[model samples]
Target: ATAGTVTVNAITSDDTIDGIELGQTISISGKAVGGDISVGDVVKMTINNTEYSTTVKAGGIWMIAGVLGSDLAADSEFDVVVTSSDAAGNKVQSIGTSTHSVDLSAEANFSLAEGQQHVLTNLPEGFGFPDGTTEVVTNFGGTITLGDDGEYRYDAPVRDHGDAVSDKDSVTVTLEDGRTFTVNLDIQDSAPVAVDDQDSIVVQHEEFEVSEIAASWVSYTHGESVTTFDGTSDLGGVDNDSAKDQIRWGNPAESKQSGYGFIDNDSNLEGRFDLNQDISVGTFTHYNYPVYSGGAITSAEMSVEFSVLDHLGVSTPVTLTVNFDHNETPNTNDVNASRDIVTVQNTHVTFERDGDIYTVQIVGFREVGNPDGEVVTSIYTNENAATSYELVVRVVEGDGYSLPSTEGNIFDDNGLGADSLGADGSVTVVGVAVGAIVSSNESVGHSIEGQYGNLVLNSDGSYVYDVTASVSDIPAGATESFAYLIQDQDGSTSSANLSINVGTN
Candidate 1:
């Protein structure tokens, strides 16, 4: 009855063929239809009429790599039909057929500037989107909506801080047929580093006419909060008995200088009276980066280096004593006289220069409102302000030996700054730097745009639609899935989707 010792036996697929990543090679194997003692069989699989073929093994097993090198536009379904024939008379026999599903898509990467706003109309150039697709966008900071004409934008309060992305932004894309992909967007920032939320462009707009400024070795910046009050809480005296312990260091939450301030080196600007030992209060020397610590500052003479960009914009480096004297009777804090503070003493930093403030020069001036009067909007043109002003604190020494700046290991991890101050005497350096002005700014600037663009729907008929992420293992119902040519009397074929425990490869 079996066509004289010729019969189609079984056909099946591995359970792991459900989730196939985009860039991987999908492998397939199945049992060949039973036939002659040792005859060849045909292994074939087709999806959407896209066919692939290979001969089955004579040993009753069937396998093929035809699905490889073949691109998949969607995560669709397929019916694998394995067939074996008796070697005796070329009697073709059909086998038990099985239905399987595979998936293929990917999560890519993209970028945008810190303050700059981009329109959905100016969509990313790559990603060949098929017809009848749409674009949708979502982010880490806030929600992103699409327009009727295929656009993404924000409105009102949602629009204010919506663009502020401190770390990353995620974009999910989907199609009507239930296929999806994602993109990891990394929004980049230029100068005045965007390390904190308050330093965001939207925040800076409320503060100064310009967010930052740099001239000579002066750096305009913002960072971790440090306690720098106007009055002396106590005398930061020697023997670790003064008010030096009152100041906090490396406090990520405690607000630091209110706005932009000058610091040739935000961290370890250390030197010595003899260049052999190190001294500082708390753990502040490790500024700008993490793991900050400052230790054992028991009275030492130090100078705060003040960078002066004169009227002509010519920069000059000047260092005067950081007068933090603890001597009860013999006062040493003097602006005119020689400030030779050499003793176990209290410390206070002052940047009070009475005459003309350092007049910095800049060019990229996007003046807001009263353009003819005091301007309030200007972005830093030079992208290297941080690197430019990072001159190790100009540490002076009595013994020919001197500690190196960040340029080497001679300096402490806690770089020099207004590390400690007393209630009676306030740090003056912050004032002089903030009081500085952008006087003689001579720059000619404008913007240019493209005139033409490649076709959105290229000549080959591929377009881009930003969509949401794809739906997961859907409960698809059964259809008439038996895929055998000969009448099946003892085979297993179900048109419905199996309860597949979802996975990724």
Candidate 2:
């Protein structure tokens, strides 16, 4: 046989040399050198001559596989012996026996980055190379290695696994013997956190016209008068406990806004005004309702848009821009000439601004002595009551986490200049209208406070009585004449005298 030598490139493990232990198998692989080595030539590997055979080849490569530990393990003193022999026609019968110890001390071992498509070669127990390895092998792994303890790490090639979950991957780890083992890897995703569906937004509107409301409600003549400030109710008439004026915005949001209830004021004015401050801005309220005493007016972009009409037939949009000191907080003792206890129990708007967007929150409506969709609380009197008017409501938009926050406080009594938001509503003034002519008739004189009297008109047009004279002091069944005066809200008056007689009874 041609002379040569053989080599083992890989140990059973990288732990130690000649370290084959009981219950484990040995894989002896190497190449021949120094001379011509041919087929039918074999390598004999054994322990104490309990032999195993592996045929060698012409290329000088050889392997002695599956040599059980039964052939290698000992009480502490056995060795693995290998010998190479010539082919059947060669001159050499066998090479000298080479003895190597079964090193129990070296039997065990363990070493183990995020780069795109990396391979963590030195894996411990069970992990799969789901994706086989092939690529720029002269990489981090192929060169000087890196990893955590025994495990390894690699960055995924893609930003996020498009439609899939973060999972384990595989790369190839090839031994010098052309034997390959799949190494494990993990891929993770990094991207705004989402918080599903939990947002509350509300905006709404309702419309009530003066002409239409007058029919179903208690009507006042052309000379009537009232002092209540509410838009839809008569406080002077009987307790408007009926459907005279009642609307509920319980869910709160109104109009087409999503979730809860919303609002949109639709008076007979143009099929109810559509306060399109956004898309189509134009004349909101009629010039009939001229605003005089109202919200603070400033030269800023903020305003509490609303409408109210007065006895003079003037109408104007009420804007709360300058300082919001309306004193609108709901309280039992707080009823005024315009607003009553029930007004606060109804939903209203709160305004706030963020960046370029102006937003509003439709809340409130909850309060003591206030009822949602409750009764009208407008005060009324026999002579007059609040009359015609309409409201144009503005709305809020875009809020919460995904967007910038438009959170802000609605003013109770007053609002600060540029920092406060705008809102909407309207309280039309009632008319002093019941008109007609009255003829004087016989009337009895009722005396009071020692000053019995005939009613007279005060210079301010309010009726008054002066004098203390009594019909009881007159003779019974005798007739007498006196003057009676009557007045109207228009300051017009008529006086007439008539004969009166006391009954004998």
Candidate 3:
């Protein structure tokens, strides 16, 4: 014997397993050791939880082999078991498991028509088409093909000429396999515009003119005391606030007395003043303040009228033009001519008869170069008169006019120089004239008493003294006192007391 043949077999009463679905089929096969095996029994099949039965042919395999009428339930698992028996009454069985997971949903394909623009629509939720695939139609007649792989390709013949196409046109796509899809289109034909040049405007001119005039005046009693006068009309009286309790002279009128003189005349002509009487031969002084706020006065010329009478009585008016010369010390003791005389032109003239009743007038007062373009106050009189007579003197100052060389410095802290009244170790005095000067001294030494010595004052108002140092003049902690005296050119003098502490180096 070659060897006894081996065989394995199993059987189930039902002879068929379950777990199948629609559009599916099953089949079975077997083998024997010494003879032909056959499926010679009835078998039943279960699909989608339903059962079917059929008888197996003799000496043949068994299978559930055809499209199932019902689809399998979603997410269901089932087992397949097969059984068979022979004439010898032997039984055999086998079991296997499987899953039903086929899909049954429908799908769509899309394309465009020839010469027609295509725009996709109604896509599955959350599905996006490829970029730059959709296009506008420029040519005629084309067929759009839809691919099963979710793609579209356009192909078609050219259309006839003279056909017009608009943005509202669209087409539907049909695949060779009879599937269809659609697309819509929108067209526009204009471009955006651009901006060009821009600019701005500005103004360029001068816009200022001289506006108003302000005048002031000060009068002094001949050789007595100096006074300050303000010609401001705003204040009820002259603004002589700087001269409180000091010797000041002005009218107490509601408005400044001299303010009216500055008002422009409606006739464009100025009044005049004449000196018509003769008096004693001495220094006659008056101060006149002229303010310019309008156009500048170009030139000033002045003249005086008077006749020489006897040494006693008043005489007729005679005309004499006054010559201006540069006098450095206009009101000082040393008044002298340091420059040439300038003839006055287009000047305003004023004169006083017996030191009363003044007259004012404007003449062609002119100067070589109008120097005093703003304010100028001048003092004038007969240098030497042989007889008592009436005379008139006039003045004019402006642009193109030559200013007097005697133009003094304005009396302000800025004009006071290093000897300013507010400097360190400086002395301040009130009620002093423009050119007044004062001096004092300090002593240093032991407790010894200091004595005053002879002092000489110079024309420049400086004083010199012979000082002596003594062994016991004064202790370092002691102090000495000295007196300072101020003398004006008019022979009036004032004194002040000063103290000094004695110290040793």
Candidate 4:
């Protein structure tokens, strides 16, 4: 019988066809359809002008692995011709071909930042060496180590190595078969840093305000409790301790004394502070950010106001405004100490300054209806007074970042803060010579803005959220979210989201 016609079923490779490299096997299979085609008929394949032959099988099919002898140029198409001959020596041929080329752009290139490390995973076929058979050539000023796991590890040189080293930084890996692959290095002077919630503080409005005593007049609801007190039972020596921790009626079930001449009744919200000879009230201290641990106060301005009940059950308003500069001297902004008179009765509030600390006091109070007699009654305080009392503090060794300072390392994996570029204490510096604090949220002043507060991000991947300025608006159980993006010197980036829960207090 005469030789039959041939049909090319496929031309494939064990690896990606388009990405096939030199010396890789290419599989060519086809069907020979004709009565003349015998099982022992010879079938041949010519791929890209290279010939490979095989005998026809019982199914009238022929297949062979045609190893590539040379690398293909870019976007090159090769011709595939399948030919078969029967016992009669009659030949028939068919052709079915398409574009087949090697793409090595991704595998042949790599980029890393200064002081960065990158590990090579898999190499292109025929490009990988057998242990000692590998040769590396580079003067890129970086360290390349061959690992026991049959991989290559590259450690990029630090930035101080100069621009010339980075400009020509490249490594070529050569194999025993004369096959080669290249790694291109892209170096940056510094990496951009970003910190997530791990290096940030979940700040709430209440954490920024000064701690208060438990009394009807001081009615600020902190953490779902009627009175927020964090102190011991002994009301004595209350003035000697930090004002943030003092005896107050935090729990309505817990009976306690105000220590400043007031008794907290456990049965109800009723509590009173009796004014007597200008009592030494608790000193109001601010929440100190740890970043400025050794910082000195530079400027402090406060506006304090309150209302008091007379012995006759009459209410009178009193206000005190003061400012302190670098001199630490208290300058009262009030003309007559800002005292409010109700029918010739004097009701006044004042702040006693010692260094940067100010101890508020009820300096004077008289009967609202009767001017001659003094009133020995209770003063009213609540979140209302908490809102009215405003104080802004500035320090010499610190930025104007207030409340909820972030600690720990955000840029580096290490938990150390002081050793980072955007350490908790300093401000962000952005440029080619430095790093950027890229965030998902828009920034306002020193912090990124949230619905209820300002998230202040430092350069070293540390940040804080200042929620004290608007704590009341944040609903309990609410989640505030924002994302932080950390970019390296080489333009490589990493990112994560930070979520903060609102306090029920």
Best by lDDT: 4
* 10 residues in a row with least lDDT, candidate 4: 383-392
Q: What is the lDDT of every predicted structure here?
A: 0.28, 0.30, 0.28, 0.40
lDDT of each residue in 220-291, candidate 1, tens digit only: 122234443212323121221221222222332223311111222213323211111111211111112111
Q: After superposition, how far is residue 267 of candidate 2 from its true place, in Å?
A: 28
Best first by lDDT, ranked: 4, 2, 3, 1
Candidate 3 RMSD to the correct structure = 35.8
- Lowest summed-lDDT stretch of 10 residues in model 1? 196-205
Measured by TM-score, the strongest candidate is 4
Model 3: per-residue Cα lDDT over 1-505, one tens digit each:
1111222122112232222222234332222222323445444546556664544454444444442423232324444444555566766544445443443322333433333334344553323223433432322334344455554444433232123544233454333322233343332222111111111111111111111212222222222123333333442233223222112223322221111111111121112211221111111122221212221122221233323332244443433333322111122233233111222232333332333222222222222133222212232322111111111222212221321111111112222232222111112221211112333222111111234122232323332332222222324454334343433322233443323333333
lDDT by residue (tens digit), candidate 4, 82-135: 455556676765443445445443245555656667785555554464457533
Encode model 2's per-residue lDDT on 177-259: one tens digit a residue: 22344444444432211111111112222221221111111221111121112223222223212222211111111221000
Q: Of the pair 2 and 4, which is ahead by lDDT? A: 4
TM-scores for the candidates: 0.24, 0.21, 0.18, 0.31
